[PDB]
Ligand binder design. Sequence first.
Ligand SMILES: OC[C@H]1O[C@H](O[C@H]2[C@@H](O)[C@H](O)[C@@H](CO)O[C@@H]2O)[C@@H](O)[C@@H](O)[C@@H]1O
Ligand SMILES: OC[C@H]1CNC[C@@H](O[C@H]2O[C@H](CO)[C@@H](O)[C@H](O)[C@H]2O)[C@@H]1O
Ligand SMILES: [Mg+2]
Length: 358
Amino acid sequence: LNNYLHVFYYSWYGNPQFDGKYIHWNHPVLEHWDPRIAKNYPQGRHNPPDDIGSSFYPELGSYSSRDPSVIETHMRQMRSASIGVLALSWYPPDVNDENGEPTDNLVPTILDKAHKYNLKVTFHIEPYSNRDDQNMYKNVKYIIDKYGNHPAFYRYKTKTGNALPMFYVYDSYITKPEKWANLLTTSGSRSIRNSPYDGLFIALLVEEKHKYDILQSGFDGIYTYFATNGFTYGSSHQNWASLKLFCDKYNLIFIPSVGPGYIDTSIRPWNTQNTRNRINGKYYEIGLSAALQTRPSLISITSFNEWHEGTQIEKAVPKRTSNTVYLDYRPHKPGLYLELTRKWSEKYSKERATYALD
Ligand SMILES: OC[C@H]1O[C@H](O[C@H]2[C@@H](O)[C@H](O)[C@@H](CO)O[C@@H]2O)[C@@H](O)[C@@H](O)[C@@H]1O
Ligand SMILES: OC[C@H]1CNC[C@@H](O[C@H]2O[C@H](CO)[C@@H](O)[C@H](O)[C@H]2O)[C@@H]1O
Ligand SMILES: [Mg+2]
């Protein structure tokens, strides 16, 4: 199991049988900012189970994230891909993404199932409204006190035997560096540095200029998230050598994010510019290769199951309805991306063993 390979995981899917209604599968079409443009595209919520807010269709159907057999299947798949860690999309208790319901209540269950498969769970902190240094302090504390003693709680284990929580902070650039510095610098007014609540905070780099903001904020690392090559400076793998060099100079953990493709046009029909064909696994393999070449301390995978954005490596199956032919992994099997991950994970694991100065 490769503990240096992290995958972005989403627990926001629901169905009537487990949640009392569809959640996320019935995603609305997101309106373009200009309503003159939006009026020429589809509108309203998708209608599961045959019409979902994805360009692909899961082997598990319009599943519930809260179904314990679904969680087990997911853990099996990640273990068989040789992924050691899932980075769980997270909102604070009683808060949720704008298209979903609260998910913090499910964390204990996900931890238990992860433990069953020797997997670890870290946290991908989403941009909840009014997220700032004050409430991030409280949420970090909350996460560590509540889940920190679970044996599947992820900690980056240094060779020195220190073991630090990790937090990926999505769209961290929304909060000013002077606010972050309150939490993340040694002498910030509400610093968690050197407290029992210390950890490795990874910032999302979008634009090149964010490099500098990230230094000023006191983050420990950078990640790039987006699966589309060319969408941002960070998501373009031509720039990963430079980011790696920068991170090395400044003692930051570089975590490039690699994806198998992208397509979100079931929910963002205006966003065809960022669509990337999977090329029967070759897009993913080019990403994985480009990441391995930078000799990174960790690699992240976008994603296990962001089905709206078509970046999932979770098992997908052919499906045709009266008006839709879903995308799929034909001519390969539903486990294609799991197999390709296992291959590159073992390369990365063997190569990463020879990075060390000792
Ligand atoms: O606009 C489409 C775009 O939206 C989402 O990402 C948003 C935000 O979270 C990102 O930080 C910035 C990066 O420039 O872009 C958007 O504002 C994603 O769903 C993305 O894949 C999509 O293309
Ligand atoms: O986890 C980081 C990031 C990944 N992409 C989706 C982002 O959420 C946003 O878009 C989805 C649809 O793709 C919506 O369902 C969410 O409400 C919205 O916040 C997510 O933050
Ligand atoms: Mg060091």
